[PDB]
C-alpha cells in the first residue's frame, strides 16, 4: 500500500464524539485510542490529517472492516471523485481546492469519507481544512447536527465543501472583473498569459465539478439503506448547489474566453503607419542623397567657377523636390 | 419536480433573472366570432376571472420583474411552481413542455 501524493510533512488525528447531551474533543497521536469509538451508539467523527504514514490507515481499515482496495483508493490521491456503496459502509472520494489571489494558481487536495455504523472516517492529505463551520456547530449547540446520526454529519461535511467551492467562485469572480477591466483599459503582455491561465483553471474546475455532481446525484437519487430517507432532501439541496456551481463555471468560461479574443482583435494593425513613415522618409531622402553626392564626387571636370550661386540653387532644387514629393503624398493622402 | 434549491435564498423563493425592471402592464384581449373585448390594466384581479371563459382569451403580462403577479397567475391557473421558475429564468434556450 503505497502513497502517491506529495504531502509527507505532518500527521494528526482529530476525534469529535458528540450527542444530544455533551460532546468530546481531543487530538490524539496514538492510534489505539480511536478504535473503541466504533461501538458507541452516538455519532462520532475521526479526522485523519495525515495519510502518508501508511500503518495508521492500514490499521484503521482493518479494524473497521474496510476492503484493502478501498484503502488503496484512499491512498491514491490522483483519483477522480466517486462514490461506491457497500453493505457495511459508504465510501466517498472528494476534492479540496484552495485559490490564491496573490498568485493565480489552482491546486487540488483529495479527501475521503467512510460512513460505516456511526463513524465518519475522514482521511486528509495535509493540514488546512474546509469543515471548520461544522466543528463550530458541533462544539456549541447551534443546529440539527447534534440531534441526528452520522449520515447528517456526512451531509454537513459535503455541504461545507460546497460552501467553500462557492467562496472560491467569489474570488474567481473578482479576478475576472479585475482582468476584464485591465484588458479593456491597459493591454499588456502578461495579460494574455493571465487570461489563458484563468481559462485553463476554469476548465479544470469544470472537469472536477462534474464528478462531484455525479457523487451527489448518486447519494440522493438512489438512497442506500445506510443513508436513511430522512436525509435525502438535504443531499438534493446540495445537488442543486452543485448545479449552481456548474452553471457559474460555464458562464465564467464563456466570458473569459471572449476576453482572450479582445487582445487578438486589438493587435496586428500597427504595421501600416510605421511602414508609411519609413516609405515616405526614404522616398524623400534617397534622391536628395544621390544628389549632393553626384556633385560632391570631387570629379573636378565641371568648371570650378561658382556661377550664379550653384550651391544655393542646388539647395533650392532640393527644396523643390521635397515640396513636389510632399504634394504627391498629399494627393495620395499619405 | 420541486423548486431548485439556491444557496443564498430562502427556500421556495422565485426570482426574476433578467435586467428590465421599468414597465409593467397586463392587456387582456377576449374575442369570439361575433364580438371582442380589448382591455388593459395594472391589476391582476381584473384578469383572473378569464380562466373559465368559454371564448378564446389572450392575456399578455408585460413585465416579469413583478414576481407577485406571476405567482398569483400561476396559482389561479394551476401552473406548477417549476414552470413559474422557468418563466422567470431568462438565461434559457427555447423549449416546450407538455402537461396534462
Amino acid at each position, epitope marked *: 500500500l503505497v502513497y502517491t501524493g506529495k504531502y509527507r510533512e505532518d500527521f494528526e488525528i482529530e476525534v469529535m464524539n458528540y450527542s444530544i447531551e455533551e460532546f468530546r474533543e481531543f487530538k490524539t497521536t496514538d492510534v489505539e485510542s480511536v478504535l473503541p469509538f466504533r461501538d458507541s451508539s452516538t455519532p462520532t467523527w475521526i479526522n485523519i490529517t495525515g495519510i502518508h504514514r501508511t500503518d495508521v490507515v492500514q490499521r484503521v481499515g482493518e479494524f473497521f472492516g474496510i476492503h484493502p482496495l478501498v484503502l488503496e483508493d484512499i491512498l491514491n490521491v490522483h483519483q477522480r471523485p466517486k462514490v461506491e456503496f457497500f453493505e457495511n459502509y459508504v465510501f466517498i472520494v472528494l476534492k479540496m481546492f484552495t485559490y490564491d489571489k496573490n498568485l493565480h494558481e489552482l491546486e487540488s487536495e483529495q479527501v475521503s469519507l467512510i460512513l460505516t455504523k456511526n463513524c465518519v472516517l475522514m482521511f486528509q492529505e495535509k493540514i488546512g481544512d474546509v469543515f471548520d463551520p461544522v466543528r463550530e456547530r458541533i462544539r456549541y449547540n447551534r443546529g440539527i447536527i447534534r440531534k441526528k446520526r452520522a449520515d447528517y454529519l456526512l451531509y454537513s461535511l459535503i455541504d461545507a465543501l460546497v460552501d467553500d467551492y462557492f467562496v472560491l467562485l467569489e474570488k474567481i*469572480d473578482d479576478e475576472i472583473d479585475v482582468l476584464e477591466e485591465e484588458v479593456l483599459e491597459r493591454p499588456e503582455k502578461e495579460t494574455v498569459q493571465r487570461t489563458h491561465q484563468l481559462k485553463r483553471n476554469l476548465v479544470e474546475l469544470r472537469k472536477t465539478i462534474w464528478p462531484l455532481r455525479e457523487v451527489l446525484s448518486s447519494l440522493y437519487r438512489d438512497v442506500p439503506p445506510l443513508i436513511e430517507k430522512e436525509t435525502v432532501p438535504y443531499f438534493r439541496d446540495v445537488y442543486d448547489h452543485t448545479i449552481q456551481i456548474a452553471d457559474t463555471v460555464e458562464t465564467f468560461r464563456d466570458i473569459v474566453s471572449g476576453l482572450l479574443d479582445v487582445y487578438l482583435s486589438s493587435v496586428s494593425n500597427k504595421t501600416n503607419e510605421v511602414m508609411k513613415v519609413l516609405t515616405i522618409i526614404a522616398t524623400i531622402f534617397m534622391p536628395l542623397t544621390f544628389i549632393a553626392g553626384i556633385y560632391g564626387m570631387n570629379f573636378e571636370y565641371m568648371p570650378e567657377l561658382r556661377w550664379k550661386w550653384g550651391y544655393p540653387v542646388v539647395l533650392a532644387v532640393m527644396g523643390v523636390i521635397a515640396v513636389i514629393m510632399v504634394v504627391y503624398f498629399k494627393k495620395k493622402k499619405w | 419536480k420541486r423548486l431548485s434549491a439556491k444557496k443564498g435564498l430562502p427556500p421556495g423563493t422565485l426570482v426574476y433573472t433578467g435586467k428590465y425592471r421599468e414597465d409593467f402592464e397586463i392587456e387582456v384581449m377576449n374575442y369570439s366570432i361575433e364580438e371582442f373585448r380589448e382591455f388593459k390594466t395594472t391589476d391582476v384581479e381584473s384578469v383572473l376571472p378569464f380562466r373559465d371563459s368559454s371564448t378564446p382569451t389572450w392575456i399578455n403580462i408585460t413585465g416579469i420583474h413583478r414576481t407577485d403577479v406571476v405567482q398569483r397567475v400561476g396559482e389561479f391557473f394551476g401552473i406548477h411552481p417549476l414552470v413559474l421558475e422557468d418563466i422567470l429564468n431568462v438565461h434559457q434556450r427555447p423549449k416546450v413542455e407538455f402537461f396534462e
Partner: antibody
Amino acid sequence: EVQLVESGGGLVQPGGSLRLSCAASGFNVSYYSIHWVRQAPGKGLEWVASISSSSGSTSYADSVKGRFTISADTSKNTAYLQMNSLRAEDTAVYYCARSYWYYIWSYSYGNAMDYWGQGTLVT
Amino acid sequence: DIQMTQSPSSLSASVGDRVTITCRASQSVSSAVAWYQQKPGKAPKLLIYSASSLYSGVPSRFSGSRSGTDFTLTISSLQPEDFATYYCQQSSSSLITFGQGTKVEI
C-alpha cells in the same frame, strides 16, 4: 400605491420590551422580504433583521441577535419586531422596508430595498 | 461580517461639477452593492443596485461602477437636490451591512 406604515414606537425603560408593527399596503408580505433598519441620532443606517414571510426564514444582526425576534402575520399583512432587553445603544429611528432579489450570476444573488417606511422613534 | 468603508466622510462640491464617492468592502462581495440617498428627516431612497444598474425613476446623472472590491458612486452634474448623505451596503450574505455615509455639502 405601495406603502409601508410603521407603529409601536415609544419611550421604554431599559430592560423593557415593546413590539414594532409594520403595516403593508399595496403588496403582500408573502411574496417579498421585509427588513428592519435602525438609524441612531447622528449615525448611519444599521441593519437589524429580515424575514421572508413565505417561508420561516429569518436573519438577525450580530449586535441584536437573541434579543430581537422578527415575525409576520400573512393574514394581517403586518411584520413585527419583538425587541427585548433594550439598552441605551438600542435607541434609534427604526425603518421598515421591503426588498426584491436580483440576479448577478448563478451562484450570486443580491437584494435591494426599493420601498421604505416613514420611520418611528424608540428610546 | 463584511465591513464597508467610505471615503470621504464628508464632501463639498458646487453645482454642475463631478462628484465621486468610493466604497470598499473588507471581504469579497460580487456585485450585491446598492446606493441610497437620504435627505435629513426622511427615509432613504434607492439609486443604484447591482453596483452598476440604475433604479427606475432615478435621474440619469447618478451612476455606479465596480473594480474588484472597489465600488464608486458618481454624479455627472450636481444639482441643488443632490445634497444629501449617501450609503453603500452589501447583500452578498444574509447579514446586510451598511456604510458609514458620505454627506455632500455645498
